[PDB]
Design a protein around this ligand. Structure first.
Ligand SMILES: Cc1ccc(-c2nn(C(C)(C)C)c3ncnc(N)c23)cc1
Ligand SMILES: Cc1ccc(-c2nn(C(C)(C)C)c3ncnc(N)c23)cc1
Lengths: 280, 280
């Protein structure tokens, strides 16, 4: 119980066909290494992939997050969402075989910088299309931030880290909830006092994501203690306008940071707004 | 609520008297930087200290862990337990001002290696005395591991990371429990299936700590998936005897890994056992 993983034959991949390589990163998310998979999703040769696994000092909750990420990735499929290829759940450790984003996370990619404002609007546009798809799939991401986005080949955005995702309507009789695992500076105001996470709350997190992009990986609300952030946001105060940001771009951030969730735009409208900035 | 920190005047220290310096480490525990504190705990000059704080992307649960660590450190006081000097809880971020262990964590100190077997028994002896004190204080550490021990000046052991500690008897009417935050390879067997954490469960974790010391920072149960560790420990299987380990030292580890918690020794007996190894 809770430790035995069900073997889904649709996603199970042989362990001998997987060649693990150098570590791409490790932390409070698991262990991710570069790898190669022969005869994957059909056949014909090898494929460069990435493999996520548990750390040597993993806790049972980190296994819950890895299984939750495994479960959500089975259902989603979008060009701007990270793609699950397979898994190794039997006769050894649990390995998730997904895509490979060589430019790494978005926050790391932005801080490494030759990017014009045209690419930044494109990056926000691609993420807005992925969230559009995830909203239509009745999924709440909750942990929408720059360090959770992956920059893949072609500098294309891939939404990742579904370990804390939830359905719009809870389809289980008894779900035991993790509490306070979302970074405060990205939580919507209704999530701060009422523990409410909806699609409109992901729009709030998308506004903070816009700020991270236009500042090329900036730290939102610099120096402000997270304890005073709630009393500050409750009085209608928001972030000031960054440097590299047009008047139309900063207006989109404030709409995502409206007090009433009903007053915030939807991702279908945000995609049409960001596309117009590419045209003009 | 939950964000406002009560100002304890006994522990409050002025922020202007604190000079933050270089970062000593950062991860799923917070942010720890080296610092200097002038006129601390009385007066007379400055003191080299360490300051723990929240990360820029901290979650509300990480504030619960920092406040729990703050609360427990107010009560304990032992030469082999990390010492709390003060805190800055008002007019800015929450900073915990504690001791300064220049040799860093124990696992990092062991992996950096000129240590004989005499020092390793001394290290285990000092930790056993601290756990002896913590047991008399009616405290359960739960997260007893090498990466949670600090090597201070004079190469002396300092127990740290009290963010997941609990009392032997719950003195609150409604405590909401974190679930599955202890690494599996250190959890006692009764904690694995029954969610039970006692002083005898810390003795189980102490046996794994002995293994980490004699192997100079080894990874317990190498390669074994944590999902198969429970079925393996349930059938009486334990770890094999390491290289640099006497027959009397490995016998102490097996006693700490007994199936019945009543059959495991207490820290008062472990200290007398480890001291005899220093004599012989
Ligand atoms: C399910 C899953 C598996 C792996 C990753 C992942 N993390 N990371 C780091 C953290 C190294 C940027 C990656 N870098 C490149 N490609 C990837 N696929 C990842 C994300 C989600
Ligand atoms: C309350 C509290 C505060 C700080 C630390 C701490 N972590 N760490 C690292 C992680 C850098 C080894 C330290 N290194 C040296 N001295 C210290 N005091 C610490 C532990 C507990």
């Amino acid at each position: 119980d809770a430790f035995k993983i069900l073997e889904d034959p649709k996603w199970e991949f042989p362990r001998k066909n997987l060649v693990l390589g150098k570590t791409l990163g490790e932390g409070e998310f698991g262990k991710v290494v570069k790898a190669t998979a022969f005869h994957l999703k059909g056949r014909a040769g090898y494929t460069t992939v990435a493999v996520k696994m548990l750390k040597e000092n993993a806790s049972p909750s980190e296994l819950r997050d890895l299984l939750s990420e495994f479960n959500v990735l089975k259902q989603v499929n979008h060009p701007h969402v990270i793609k699950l290829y397979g898994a190794c759940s039997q006769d050894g450790p649990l390995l998730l075989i997904v895509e490979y984003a060589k430019y790494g996370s978005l926050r790391g990619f932005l801080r490494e910088s030759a990017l014009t404002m045209g690419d930044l609007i494109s990056f926000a546009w691609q993420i807005s299309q992925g969230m559009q798809y995830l909203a239509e799939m009745k999924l709440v991401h909750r942990d929408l931030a720059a360090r959770n986005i992956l920059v893949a080949e072609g500098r294309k955005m891939k939404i990742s880290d579904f370990g804390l995702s939830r359905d719009v309507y809870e389809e289980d009789s008894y779900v035991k909830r993790s509490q306070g695992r979302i970074p405060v500076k990205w939580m919507a105001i209704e999530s701060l006092f009422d523990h409410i996470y909806t699609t409109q709350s992901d729009v709030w997190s998308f506004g903070v994501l816009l700020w991270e992009i236009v500042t090329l990986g900036g730290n939102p609300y610099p120096g402000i203690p997270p304890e005073r952030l709630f009393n500050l946001l409750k009085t209608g105060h928001r972030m000031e306008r960054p440097d590299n940001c047009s008047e139309e771009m900063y207006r989109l951030m404030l709409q995502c940071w409206k007090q009433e969730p009903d007053k915030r735009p939807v991702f279908a409208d945000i995609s049409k707004d960001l596309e117009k900035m590419m045209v003009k």
